[PDB]
Amino acid sequence: DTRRRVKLYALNAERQWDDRGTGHVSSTYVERLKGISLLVRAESDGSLLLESKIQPDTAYQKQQDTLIVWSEGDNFDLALSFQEKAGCDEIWEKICQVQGKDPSVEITQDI
């Protein structure tokens, strides 16, 4: 499959986006996180590269149709880079459903 194929980037101390690996993204409820979460499974070894709860108030930003970019904590910035816009749209729609947004928005919070 390629529709959900992604690269995970993380911003480092030197403010470079570090390539953390290629994988496939999905969403599901994760009990230990108590909410719908984004999961990325690594192409390399099938491990979870990402397991990130969709908080209700996180500002997710869609950039260039194929990037979903957000702050995961203090000094912790992440980006999902999608191979396909169609896949980006699916995950964006799910984020918007969880937060209660119109999926035509390009950022899920004001400011």
């Binding site: 950039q63 260039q64 990037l67 970019v69 957000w70 999608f82 191979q83």
Partner: peptide, 11 residues
């Protein structure tokens, strides 16, 4: 070319 890199982090 396959995967875009972000321009800036989110606000």
């Amino acid at each position: 070319v396959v995967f875009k890199k972000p321009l800036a982090p989110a606000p």
